[PDB]
Amino acid sequence: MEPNPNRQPVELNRTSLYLGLLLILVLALLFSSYFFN
Amino acid sequence: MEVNQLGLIATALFVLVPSVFLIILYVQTESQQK
């Protein structure tokens, strides 16, 4: 099978990881009280 | 206290699923050449 020419490598740098995890963890810290209710 | 019983799994998956998405992306980025 011919390889697909539209493929593209994906990236997430470390700073983006830290920002993302901060976002998730802080969102969870915020919404968890409402999830337990 | 009488909390919602799905609160625990909801919170755990809320954290874990997108965190894991990010970790996968980060690690496969580090492992690329150069």
């Binding site: 740098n13 995890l21 901060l22 | 206290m1 609160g7 625990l8």
Partner: peptide, 30 residues
């Protein structure tokens, strides 16, 4: 278990502070 959850998430956040500061990608001048 609710308390354990709150304290867990908080603890993870502090850990993240540690890594984000001391194990940041170092800024480099071109």
């Amino acid at each position: 278990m609710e308390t354990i959850t709150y304290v867990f998430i908080f603890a993870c956040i502090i850990a993240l502070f540690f890594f984000a500061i001391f194990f940041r990608e170092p800024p480099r001048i071109t």
